[PDB]
Design a protein around this ligand. Structure first.
Ligand SMILES: O=c1ccn([C@H]2C[C@H](O)[C@@H](COP(=O)(O)OP(=O)(O)O)O2)c(=O)[nH]1
Ligand SMILES: O=c1ccn([C@H]2C[C@H](O)[C@@H](COP(=O)(O)OP(=O)(O)O)O2)c(=O)[nH]1
Ligand SMILES: O=c1ccn([C@H]2C[C@H](O)[C@@H](COP(=O)(O)OP(=O)(O)O)O2)c(=O)[nH]1
Ligand SMILES: [Mg+2]
Ligand SMILES: [Mg+2]
Ligand SMILES: [Mg+2]
Lengths: 135, 140, 130
């Protein structure tokens, strides 16, 4: 229902897509080949940049399959993609397994991007919650 | 908005909301597991849900255990698609350096939130300039 | 936008959290204390603020990506959940995910960011099958 303008910085990757009609997000690909030794991280390029609509927010989540099979994870999950950010999306992958290295290949689905509305609240300082009227 | 839930395992209580405005409901562990420092495990929660179309279920780590024993969830926030009718599982991991964590069946290991999600339609463009979506000053 | 979030600076010594750019998703929270994390160790840090999340909404504590990459800084229970009813101080479960370098956090540093979104306060209805 909502359109998202997306730019394939790396035309060699497939355009991210939604697997089923109600599926929460679209899987992002790795534009590079990387290997993580146990406990090490990396900042991988996905080869895409998005135009998140004002009032919404992009959110990068880890894939559960990999998370369990090989203990693959994202250091700053959920990664926040601001509506204004027009740069390339990057994933902070980390190997949380104790002994087995993870090998990521360019073309691999290494995360998923969800889009949600966000409340751009206005912060209003108060002295106390009682005074304001919130106890 | 109601969420149809099936207790695959009838021995566990039905998840519920502690207070009127609470974001989610704590899910239970249907099994007994012990995690060594740095090890993970996929635990069954004894429940399946029917997240409404246009929405998404989100599995978050409980903060109390997160601090006290360093308990966590590898793919947090876990995504539960509206079409998913399987059992909800939690990828627990022990992030503490030396103390093993013991999960007992009946323990509240995570919490389920439900939020609306934008079912976006991706439309590719060669640049953001033509559509007035360029971050000029911010420089991307 | 029109939704306002009541905030109390428990520690007045810190700046009020703010939004950097117009559509930015959250506001950076500060550390009210000095902490140092050896590799693999965690710490519950005070941010010096308490908020009143509107009913039907939820506060979400996210890790900052810069630090996540440069030094492997993370948050154990990310995304931290702040209930609309919670009126206590916001604390961040920081953890050092780097293998060998200690992370040093200074009071005044921006250690996380708070987002606010609406949440569906669903009513669960048990059914024997789908
Ligand atoms: O990062 C966080 C997460 C939670 N809370 C507080 C506010 C929220 O209302 C309460 C939520 O508790 P929880 O994280 O859901 O779990 P627990 O049951 O372990 O307290 O704890 C914080 O101060 N910081
Ligand atoms: O914490 C979680 C996350 C996901 N799921 C299930 C429900 C969801 O419909 C499906 C999502 O899979 P995913 O996270 O995209 O993983 P992958 O596609 O890598 O299998 O897995 C769970 O039971 N628990
Ligand atoms: O997984 C992620 C997270 C963030 N970003 C970019 C886009 C977003 O708009 C910006 C957000 O910066 P932040 O998370 O506030 O980082 P920091 O404050 O540490 O620089 O960084 C990515 O490309 N990938
Ligand atoms: Mg998937
Ligand atoms: Mg709780
Ligand atoms: Mg920031």
């Amino acid at each position: 229902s909502t359109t998202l303008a997306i730019v394939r910085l790396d035309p060699g990757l497939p355009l991210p897509s939604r697997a089923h009609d109600g599926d929460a997000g679209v899987d992002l690909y790795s534009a590079e080949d990387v290997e993580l030794a146990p406990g090490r991280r990396a900042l991988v390029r996905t080869g895409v940049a998005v135009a998140v609509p004002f009032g919404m927010v992009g959110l990068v989540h880890p894939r559960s399959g990999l998370a369990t099979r090989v203990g693959l994870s994202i250091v700053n999950s959920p990664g926040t993609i601001d509506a204004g950010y027009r740069g390339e999306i990057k994933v902070a992958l980390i190997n949380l397994d104790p002994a087995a290295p993870i090998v990521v290949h360019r073309g691999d689905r290494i995360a998923q991007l969800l889009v949600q509305r966000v409340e751009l609240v206005e912060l209003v300082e108060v002295s106390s919650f009682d005074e304001a009227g919130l106890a």
